[PDB]
Amino acid sequence: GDRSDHAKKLKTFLENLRRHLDRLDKHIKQLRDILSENPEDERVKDVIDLSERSVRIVKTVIKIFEDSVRKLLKQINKEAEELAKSPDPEDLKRAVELAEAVVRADPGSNLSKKALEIILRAAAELAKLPDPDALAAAARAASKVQQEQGSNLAKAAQEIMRQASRAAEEAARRAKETLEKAEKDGDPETALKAVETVVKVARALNQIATMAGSEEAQERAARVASEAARLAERVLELAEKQGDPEVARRARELQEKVLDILLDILEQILQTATKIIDDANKLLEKLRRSERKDPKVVETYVELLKRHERLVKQLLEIAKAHAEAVEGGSLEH
Amino acid sequence: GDRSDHAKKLKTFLENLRRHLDRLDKHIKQLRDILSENPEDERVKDVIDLSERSVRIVKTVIKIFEDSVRKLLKQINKEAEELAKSPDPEDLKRAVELAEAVVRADPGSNLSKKALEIILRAAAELAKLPDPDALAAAARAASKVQQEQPGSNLAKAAQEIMRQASRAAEEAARRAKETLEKAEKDGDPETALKAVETVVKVARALNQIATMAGSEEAQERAARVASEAARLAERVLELAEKQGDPEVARRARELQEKVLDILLDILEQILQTATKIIDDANKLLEKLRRSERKDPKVVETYVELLKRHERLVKQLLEIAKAHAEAVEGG
Amino acid sequence: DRSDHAKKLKTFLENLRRHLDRLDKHIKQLRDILSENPEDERVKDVIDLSERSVRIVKTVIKIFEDSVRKLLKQINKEAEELAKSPDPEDLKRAVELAEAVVRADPGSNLSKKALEIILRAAAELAKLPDPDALAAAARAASKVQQEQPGSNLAKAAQEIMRQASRAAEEAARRAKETLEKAEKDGDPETALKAVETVVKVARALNQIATMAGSEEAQERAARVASEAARLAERVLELAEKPEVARRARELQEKVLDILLDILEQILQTATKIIDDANKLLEKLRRSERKDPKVVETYVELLKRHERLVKQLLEIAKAHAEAVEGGS
Numbered sequence: 001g002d003r004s005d006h007a008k009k010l011k012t013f014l015e016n017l018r019r020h021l022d023r024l025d026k027h028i029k030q031l032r033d034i035l036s037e038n039p040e041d042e043r044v045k046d047v048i049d050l051s052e053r054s055v056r057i058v059k060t061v062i063k064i065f066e067d068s069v070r071k072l073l074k075q076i077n078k079e080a081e082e083l084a085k086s087p088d089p090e091d092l093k094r095a096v097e098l099a100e101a102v103v104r105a106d107p108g109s110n111l112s113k114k115a116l117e118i119i120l121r122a123a124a125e126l127a128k129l130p131d132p133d134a135l136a137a138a139a140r141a142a143s144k145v146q147q148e149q150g151s152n153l154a155k156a157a158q159e160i161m162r163q164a165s166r167a168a169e170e171a172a173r174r175a176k177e178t179l180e181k182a183e184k185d186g187d188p189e190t191a192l193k194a195v196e197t198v199v200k201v202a203r204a205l206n207q208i209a210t211m212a213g214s215e216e217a218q219e220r221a222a223r224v225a226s227e228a229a230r231l232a233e234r235v236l237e238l239a240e241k242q243g244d245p246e247v248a249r250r251a252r253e254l255q256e257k258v259l260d261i262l263l264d265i266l267e268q269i270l271q272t273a274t275k276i277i278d279d280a281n282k283l284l285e286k287l288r289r290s291e292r293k294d295p296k297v298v299e300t301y302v303e304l305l306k307r308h309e310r311l312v313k314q315l316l317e318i319a320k321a322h323a324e325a326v327e328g329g330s331l332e333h
Numbered sequence: 334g335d336r337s338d339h340a341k342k343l344k345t346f347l348e349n350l351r352r353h354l355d356r357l358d359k360h361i362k363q364l365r366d367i368l369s370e371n372p373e374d375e376r377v378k379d380v381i382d383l384s385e386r387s388v389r390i391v392k393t394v395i396k397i398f399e400d401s402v403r404k405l406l407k408q409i410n411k412e413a414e415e416l417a418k419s420p421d422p423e424d425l426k427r428a429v430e431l432a433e434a435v436v437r438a439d440p441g442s443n444l445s446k447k448a449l450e451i452i453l454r455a456a457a458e459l460a461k462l463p464d465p466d467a468l469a470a471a472a473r474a475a476s477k478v479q480q481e482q483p484g485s486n487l488a489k490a491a492q493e494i495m496r497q498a499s500r501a502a503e504e505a506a507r508r509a510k511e512t513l514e515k516a517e518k519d520g521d522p523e524t525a526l527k528a529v530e531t532v533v534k535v536a537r538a539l540n541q542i543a544t545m546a547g548s549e550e551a552q553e554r555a556a557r558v559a560s561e562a563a564r565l566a567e568r569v570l571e572l573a574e575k576q577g578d579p580e581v582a583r584r585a586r587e588l589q590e591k592v593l594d595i596l597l598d599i600l601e602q603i604l605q606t607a608t609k610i611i612d613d614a615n616k617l618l619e620k621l622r623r624s625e626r627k628d629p630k631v632v633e634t635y636v637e638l639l640k641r642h643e644r645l646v647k648q649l650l651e652i653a654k655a656h657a658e659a660v661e662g663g
Numbered sequence: 664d665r666s667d668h669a670k671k672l673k674t675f676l677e678n679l680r681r682h683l684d685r686l687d688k689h690i691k692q693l694r695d696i697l698s699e700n701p702e703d704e705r706v707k708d709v710i711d712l713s714e715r716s717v718r719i720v721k722t723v724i725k726i727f728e729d730s731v732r733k734l735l736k737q738i739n740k741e742a743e744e745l746a747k748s749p750d751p752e753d754l755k756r757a758v759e760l761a762e763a764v765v766r767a768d769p770g771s772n773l774s775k776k777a778l779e780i781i782l783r784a785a786a787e788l789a790k791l792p793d794p795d796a797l798a799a800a801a802r803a804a805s806k807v808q809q810e811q812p813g814s815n816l817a818k819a820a821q822e823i824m825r826q827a828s829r830a831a832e833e834a835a836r837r838a839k840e841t842l843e844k845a846e847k848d849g850d851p852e853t854a855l856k857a858v859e860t861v862v863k864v865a866r867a868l869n870q871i872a873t874m875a876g877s878e879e880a881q882e883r884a885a886r887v888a889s890e891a892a893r894l895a896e897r898v899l900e901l902a903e904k905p906e907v908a909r910r911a912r913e914l915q916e917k918v919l920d921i922l923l924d925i926l927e928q929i930l931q932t933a934t935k936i937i938d939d940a941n942k943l944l945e946k947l948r949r950s951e952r953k954d955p956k957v958v959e960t961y962v963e964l965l966k967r968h969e970r971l972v973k974q975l976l977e978i979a980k981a982h983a984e985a986v987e988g989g990s
Contacts, residue, residue, distance in 0.1 A: 006920035013927060020934045027941040034948055050965055054972050061972075061979050068983045072919075075990055079912075259405075260339045267346045270353065277356055281363075288367060305383050312387045319394050323401040329408040593734070594668050601675050608682050615689050622696055639712055646716045646723075653723045657730035663737050 007101060010069065017062055024055050073102045073111050077118065084121045089134055095122045096141045107148070116153055119145060123160045130171045132200035136207050139164050143211035164208055165217065172201040172224055179231060188242060191235045192250045199228050199257055206265045213272065215314055218265055222314075225265065226321040228258045233328035240332070255328060262322045266315060273311040280304040337430075340438055343402070350395055357388055403444070410435055410448050417454040422462050425455040429474045436481065449478050453490050460497040463505050465534040469541050472498040476545035492546070499542050499551060506535040506558060513565065522573040523581050529569050532562045533588060537595050544602050549645050556599050556652045563592040563659035589663055596656045600649060607645045614638040669763055672731070679724050686717050732773065735764050739777045746784040751796055757784045758803045765810065778807055782819055789827045792834040794863040797827045801871040824875055828868070828883075835864035835887060842894060851907035854898050858914050861891045865921045873928045878971055881925055885974070888925065889981040892918045892988055915989050922982040926975065933971040940964040 031048050038044065076098055083095030095118065102115040123138035123145075142161050146154035179194030205221030236251035238244070283301045287293060361384045368377040409431050416428030432448040432455070439445055452474055459471030472495045479491040509528040516525040536559035543552040566589045573582030617635035621627055693710045697703070738760050745757040761784065764777035781803060788800035801824050808820040838857035845854035865888045872880030892915050899911030943961045947953060 003916055003920065006923055009920070009923055009927065013923060013930075016927070016930060016934075020930060020937070023934060023937045023941070027937055027944070030941065030944060030948075037948075047962075047965065050969060054965075054969050057969075057972050057976060061976055064976075064979045064983050068979075068986045071990075072986050075986070256336050260335070260342075263339060263343060263346065267342070267349070270346070270349055274349070274353060274356070277353075277360060281360060284360075284363070302380075305380060309383055309387055312390050315394050316390050316397075319397050319401075323397060326401055326405045326408070329412075330404075590665075590668075594664075597668065597671060597675060601671065601678075604675070604678055604682055608678070608685060611682075611685050611689060615685070615692065618689070618692055622692070636709070639709065643712060643716050646719045650719055650723045650726070653726050657726055657733075660730045660734045660737070663734065 007105065011105065014062075014065065014069075017058065017065075021055065021058055024051060024058070027051065028055065069105070070111060073105060073115075076102050077111065077114055080115065080118045080122075084118055084125065087125065089126070089129055089131065092122045092125050093134070093137060095119075096126075096137070100141070100144065103148070116145060116148070120153060120156055120160070123157070124163070127160050127163045127167050130167070130174075132168065132171065132197065132204045135164050135168050135171070136204040139204070139208040139211055143208075146212075158212070161208060161212055165205070165220065168201050168204050168208070169220070169224075172198055172205075175201070176227075176231075183234065183238065186238065186242060188235065188238045188244050188247045191238060192247055192254075195228070195231055195235050195251075195254055198224065198231060199254060199261065202228055202258065202261050206261055206268065209265070210268050215269065215272070215311060218269055219314065222262070222265055222318050222321070225258050225261050226324065228261075229255060229325040229328055232258065233332060236328070236332055255325065259322065259325055262318065262325065266318055266322065269311060269314055269318070273308055273315070276304055276308045276311060280308070337434055340434065344438065347395070347399070350391065350398075354388065354391060357384060357391070361385065361388070402438075406435055406438060406444055410444055410451065413448075413451050413455075417451060417458065420458075422459065422464070422467055425458050426467075426470065429455050429470075433474065433477065436477075440481070445481075449481065449487055452478055453487060453494065456491075456494050457497075460494055460501050463501070465502055465505055465531060465538040468498045468501050468505075469538040472542040472545060495542060495546055499539060499546075499554070502535045502539050502542070503558065506532050509535075510565075513568075517572060520572075520576045522569065522576055522578040522585075525569050525572065526581055526584055529562070529565050529585070529588065532565060533591055533595075536562050537591070540595055540599055540602075543599070547602075547606065549603060549606065549648050552599055552603055553648055553652065556596070556655065559592055559595045559599070560655040560659065563589065563596075563662060566592065567662045586663075589659075592659055593656070596652070596659060600652060600656070603645060603649050603652065607642055607649065610638055610642045610645070614642060665763075669767060672767070676724075676728070676731075679720070679727070683717065683720055683724075686713060686720065689713055690717070735767060735773055735777075739764055739773065739780060742777065743780045743783075746780060746787065749787070751788070751791055751793070754784055754788045754796075755799065757781075758788075758799070762803065762806070765806075769810065775811075778810060778816070782807055782816060782823070785820075786823050786826070789823060789830060792830070792837065794831060794834055794860065794867040797831050797834070798867040798870050801827050801867075801874060805874045821875070824871060828871060828880070831864060831868055831871070832887070835861045838864070839894065842897070846897065846901055849901070851898070851902040854901050855907050855910055855914075858891065858895050858898050858911070861887075861894060862914055862917050862921070865891055865918065866924070869921065869925050869928065873924075876932065878929065878932065878974060881928060882974060884925060885978050885981060888918060888922055889985060891921075892985040896988055912989075915985070919982065919985060922978065922985065926978060926982070929971055929975050929978065933968055933975070936964050936968050936971070940968065 028048065028051055031044060031051065034044055035048070080095040080099040080102075083091050083098065086092065099115045099119045099122070103112045106112060119141050123142045126134050126138040126141075129135065139161055142157040142164065145151075145157040149157075175194050175197040179191055179198070182188075182190045182194065202221060202225040205224050206218065209215075209217035209221045232251055232254040235254070236248060239247035239251055280301060283297065283304065287298070287301070290297075361381065364377065364381050364384065368374060368381060371377065413428045413431040413435075416424050416431075419425070429452060432452040435448040436445045436452075456471045456475040456478075459467050459474075462468065462471075475491045475494040475498070479488045479495075482488060509532045512528045513525055516522070516528055536555055539555035539558055540552070543555045566585055569585040569588070570582060573579070573585055614635060617631060617638065621631060621635065624631075690710065690713055693706050693713065697706045697710065742757045742761045742764070745753050745760070748754070748757075758781060761777050761781040765774050765781070768774045785800040785804040788796055788803075791797070804820040804823045808817045808824075811817060838860040841860075842854050842857040845857055865884065868884040868887065869881060872884045895911055895914040895918060898914070899908045902908040902911060940961060943957075943964065947958065947961065
């Protein structure tokens with residue numbers, strides 16, 4: 001946007017001044033280098049002084065700006081901390097965006113630190129809300145805390161993620177019940193909305209899993225997603241039963257969403273397996289060239305082979321589930 | 334949209350699996366090498382055991398997955414067949430995308446053949462619909478079939494459908510003229526605005542249908558059609574200013590531009606064709622200068638290229654002339 | 664829509680001559696073959712047919728280039744009359760149409776007359792207080808100065824560019840006047856728009872300044888920018904005393920970005936000079952016999968550079984105030 005270009009312009013602008021500063025200095029040196037040719041000549045020395053003043057001047061400009069920028073980040077910090085307390089989702093999320101941006105402007109600083117801590121509160125609060133996308137966002141923001149940081153904040157961040165997973169799971173549980181409760185009542189509109197929500201929890205679960213990369217987390221997300229198709233399959237039935245032609249498309253479209261979700265999870269797992277083996281080869285590559293085998297390393301190699309057997313085994317399992325989802329089309333009609 | 338986004342991903346995903354096989358299968362081969370050095374290294378036998386099993390897993394994953402998708406496409410190709418029967422153009426248009434979407438995934442197979450047959454039915458349906466843009470989209474879908482397999486029965490049908498689309502468009506264009514005269518008698522420029530507007534869309538629509546077919550003759554019929562539409566604009570302009578809708582009459586003089594656009598687009602294609610032809614002619618001659626003996630079979634086609642190339646230029650000018658006749662009225 | 668056409672037009676004329684060449688190359692093929700063996704009659708015919716079509720294609724260019732000129736002439740006349748029209752949207756159309764004529768055929772006389780037409784329109788566009796439009800008058804007019812610099816025309820642009828500036832400053836002043844009224848009345852939407860109007864003036868003025876390039880122009884733009892935030896601080900407090908408070912903060916964020924824009928513009932100028940100054944220098948150190956007049960040129964650039972850097976400071980301080988004020 002306009003402000004997002006200007007933030008880069010802020011990051012760019014600062015770099016530009018150093019760029020100009022060099023140009024002064026590189027030019028200065030040339031005048032400095034002309035000095036040695038005719039040292040006695042004062043005029044050149046006078047010139048150096050003029051251009052030097054410019055350099056010194058410019059330095060202050062950096063000082064002011066970096067102060068001003070840092071000051072603006074402080075002001076930006078405050079808005080977030082306040083936006084963290086307000087329970088409204090957009091307000092809390094707005095606290096995140098403002099927070100994250102302060103970091104991007106200048107990571108690895110104590111100003112960023114307070115912004116890092118500020119995020120944490122928001123994600124916990126967002127973790128309370130049951131909107132899947134919101135819960136996904138907290139995972140996004142929470143994961144950013146760890147990925148940027150193994151740190152205590154990350155250790156706390158993991159809890160928010162953990163809370164998020166459980167929060168997403170409970171959100172999955174209740175919507176399942178309501179979606180379940182509706183079938184005997186026969187209101188398909190509530191079902192299509194109830195159905196879509198679990199899927200949202202599946203995405204979240206998948207999205208959250210990737211960010212921390214837990215195959216188990218992928219599995220739970222995997223567990224969630226598969227049920228959805230069965231739930232979507234049954235929703236298509238109530239639509240076919242009650243003469244509800246529009247909803248059928250909502251059921252039909254939901255089927256594809258999970259497939260890509262499942263596919264998204266499948267491809268998510270396979271990328272890890274790729275990495276895992278490559279670790280083994282580099283690890284293995286040392287053994288053959290190794291003077292003497294090292295058990296701690298050799299055992300480490302084993303786990304890699306064994307976990308690939310894990311990760312590969314997961315792919316096989318989920319593959320059937322993905323094949324199951326396809327089955328729902330033929331049987332019902 | 335995001336369903337079409339995934340189809341690239343799913344096809345891509347397969348390659349990473351096949352990629353993983355060679356990674357694993359290669360990695361095993363190295364372990365095989367280590368075992369070759371010391372054929373009695375029990376652990377080396379143990380490690381290899383895991384991998385050939387893991388390979389068996391993935392090997393199963395593929396056959397499962399690619400079979401799963403084959404059955405999947407079956408759903409999509411089947412469901413679209415029902416959509417074609419329905420009269421809702423949007424549903425058909427939607428139906429087209431699925432059959433269209435299918436072919437991209439698995440070109441050249443039997444199921445794609447079933448998609449092609451489906452695509453035509455919906456395309457044939459759109460030739461009946463009177464919306465000029467819709468008549469174009471049908472052609473657009475129809476031509477894709479001719480591209481997939483020329484010289485087939487479907488290639489025959491497609492050209493047969495594309496022809497009907499060109500036919501249908503003129504009827505709507507004729508209709509506006511009929512309704513145009515009514516607008517003249519009933520003194521309502523606003524109607525003629527859309528009436529002429531519909532005509533303009535036809536010529537534009539007809540060009541696009543002309544382009545895919547890439548037949549110079551059809552282009553001139555589209556050109557001839559467009560040339561009159563420019564005259565209609567003048568007929569719209571005169572009646573409009575007098576009878577009380579200048580601001581709407583502002584669109585007509587603006588519409589006069591669109592005709593010039595269509596005329597430019599027609600000529601651009603006509604030349605682009607002509608350039609290609611003359612290139613081949615040069616190529617054919619090049620073969621003939623080098624050749625030990627002139628093979629009349631090549632010469633005959635070479636000359637025919639020149640003859641055909643000539644016709645286009647004549648076609649180009651008479652069009653180029655009409656383009657001015659369009660401007661001159663302005 | 665139209666954007667594609669003018670470009671699409673340019674190719675076709677280019678491709679036409681381009682096509683004409685391929686024909687002559689084919690003729691070159693038959694001319695050589697013919698020279699190798701005069702006896703082949705079949706070459707002559709194919710030459711003739713190849714020769715026949717070339718004339719037609721050559722003719723078509725004449726038809727088209729002529730016809731294209733007529734439309735450029737027609738648009739010029741319609742552009743002029745639309746120029747007369749007071750309605751502002753009509754004014755743009757004239758420009759938009761008038762520019763098309765120029766970019767379609769730079770340097771031509773017909774193009775010269777349109778550029779002349781163009782110039783009249785911006786003057787009419789200058790009068791209207793809407794800041795967004797004022798820049799447009801400055802925008803299109805500046806294009807003319809670059810197309811025909813230093814001519815009798817360029818002075819009109821420069822003078823026309825100046826006229827907007829004198830007019831523009833008052834439209835921002837009207838906002839200051841409107842807000843004090845808006846403040847007493849208490850309409851939060853009414854007060855915010857005045858700031859956004861003042862903010863618009865800023866971005867417009869710097870663009871006008873940046874487009875002419877004079878460091879002075881950006882300087883006059885400097886003083887206004889600072890006090891917009893002092894206004895923007897009031898509106899949020901007026902709205903507090905939801906929709907209006909959230910945007911009031913945004914306005915401050917738009918000002919600082921505007922300060923930044925002014926900053927980058929000062930710099931780019933400044934930095935370009937030092938290359939020129941350094942490049943200027945190298946020639947001096949190199950040339951055995953120095954040319955004192957050229958030395959002076961160098962000096963004024965280093966002096967100017969110092970002058971331009973000072974401004975950055977003077978600006979950067981004002982900018983600094985804006986952030987503090989927003990605290």
